[PDB]
């Protein structure tokens, strides 16, 4: 006979949350990845200096002169950050993150410019030789959709 204004408006806010659910869920993940990136960076300094001073990429965190323990460079969504031959990889925690990005990671690596180096940011990579890396293809890479426009670099970016 009457009461449908309360019933529909409680059910439009319910469906509004369902539509606002995936937007906040990738905005959210995309936000948790933007930090793995900040934790990865700032460690470029150590790595850059080590390379320019010696001409060899730092083998591990201790070589680069950073928390000798990967797990000591963690965060809220970051379970750690390891330096492996100049390549700095950031791992996403398992608690406090999206759902399709946890335990997932990215990498920052550089290239000899000769007198200086240039840095790249993208999906996990392994270093082959002092001037070549390759996709750490394995299945734990953070999905392209979660990576900034500034971190879409490919293993062979120059």
Ligand X SMILES: *[C@@H]1O[C@H](CO)[C@@H](NC(C)=O)[C@H](O[C@H]2O[C@H](CO)[C@H](O)[C@H](O)[C@H]2O)[C@H]1NC(C)=O
Of 101, 89, 111, 91, residue with least CA distance to 156: 111
Q: Residue 59 interacts with ligand X (CB under 6 A)?
A: yes
Query: What does the alpha-carbon distance between residue 104 and residue 93 come to, in Å, rounded to a whole number?
Result: 8
Considering the complex, what minimum distance in angstroms separates the CB of residue 126 from a second copy?
A: 20
Q: Which of 45, 132, 144, 154 binds a second copy (CB under 8 A)?
A: 144
Which among 33-41, 44-52, 108-116, 134-142 is the span making contact with a second copy, rule CB under 8 A? Answer: 108-116
| Binding residue for a second copy, selected from 69, 150, 154, 156, defined by CB under 8 A | 150
12 versus 56: smaller Cβ distance to ligand X: 56
4 binds a second copy (CB under 8 A): yes
Does 139 bind a second copy (CB under 8 A)? Our answer is no
Judged by CB under 8 A, does residue 158 bind a second copy? no
The reply on whether position 58 binds ligand X by CB under 6 A is: yes
CB-wise, 17 or 38, nearer to a second copy?
Answer: 17
φ, ψ of residue 118 to 5 degrees: the values are -120, 140
CA–chain centroid gap for 14, Å, is 33
The CA distances from residue 13 to 5, 10, 94, 139, 147, in Å, are: 12, 5, 31, 38, 31
Nearer to ligand X, 45 or 62 (CB): 62
Q: List contacts with a second copy (CB under 8 A).
A: 1-26, 28-30, 54-55, 62, 64-67, 73, 75-76, 95-100, 108, 112-119, 121, 143-146, 148-151
């Amino acid at each position: 006979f009457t009461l449908i204004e309360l019933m529909i408006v409680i059910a439009i806010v319910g469906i509004l949350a369902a539509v606002a659910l995936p937007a906040y869920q990738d905005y959210t993940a995309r936000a948790q990845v933007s930090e793995a990136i900040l934790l990865a960076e700032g460690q470029k300094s150590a790595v850059t200096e080590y390379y320019l001073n010696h001409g060899k990429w730092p083998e591990n965190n201790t070589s680069a002169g950073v928390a000798s323990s990967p797990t000591d460079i963690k965060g809220k969504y970051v379970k750690e950050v390891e330096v492996k031959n100049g390549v700095v990889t950031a791992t996403m925690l398992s608690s406090g993150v999206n759902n399709e990005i946890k335990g997932k990671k990215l990498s920052l690596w550089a290239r000899r410019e000769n007198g200086s180096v240039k840095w790249f940011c993208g999906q996990p990579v392994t270093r082959t030789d002092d001037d070549t890396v390759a996709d750490a293809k394995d299945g734990k890479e953070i999905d392209t959709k979660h990576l900034p426009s500034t971190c879409r670099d490919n293993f062979d970016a120059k």
